[PDB]
Amino acid sequence: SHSMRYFSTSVSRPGRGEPRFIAVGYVDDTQFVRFDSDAASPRGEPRAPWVEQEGPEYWDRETQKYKRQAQTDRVSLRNLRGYYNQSEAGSHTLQWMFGCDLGDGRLLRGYDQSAYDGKDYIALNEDLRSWTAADTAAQITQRKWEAAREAEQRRAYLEGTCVEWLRRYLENGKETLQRAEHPKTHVTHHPEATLRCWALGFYPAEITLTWQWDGEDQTQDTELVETRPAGDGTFQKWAAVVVPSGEEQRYTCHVQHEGLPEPLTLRW
């Protein structure tokens, strides 16, 4: 159930020069590439080991495509300002996201959509041949892209190029991309008292934490934080509960994760 995803952002700064462009790429939960237009020598930079040995031809072609897209965004930002009758003084944001999902081993579904100032603008439909415009301004873009046969080009990338290279990355980095890392767990006691179940250093980010009581889920009184990055490629999460001081040994924490042979059960 692997996937490859790209995220691009352009932000305009009237007066302080031409817009800022940043793009990043992921395979599942692992970043592997970045590009920033404000760097001294702007170029595509690897962020995972399994793309570090692709050769200078590969990385020069990627760099040229990034610089082309930043120039394309600069024109689009000027066009959007005209569609919406906006002044030339304010700052505006344009975001773009695309990628492919794999299953039998081929394309499960593709993505390609855009946003302006935080709201939907235009998106490629799941048929990879028609568009969904969000307002009357985006209808101008749809008419231009239909006349340019542009949906044909995005479908060809998503069904061929996206799938081929995702398979290549998954093979060259299969020792880290296809080997899950199990969480390290422990329970802490904080004085009626508080029981906290920890899970640290796991990959991928998908995980489930559940407190119990003689086999009964305790969902009603469970504090739970959002999954957060550890900073080294792994993730953390904890779930807490409050308990009558004395019944601590009646409660159990349960962990479900890809890196465990079978689900875990913990006590304080």
């Binding site: 790429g25 590439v33 990627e62 897209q69 689009s76 959007l80 873009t141 892209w145 990338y157």
Partner: peptide, 8 residues
């Protein structure tokens, strides 16, 4: 592998 497309 990145991809670059038309202007809006």
């Amino acid at each position: 592998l990145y991809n670059t497309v038309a202007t809006l």
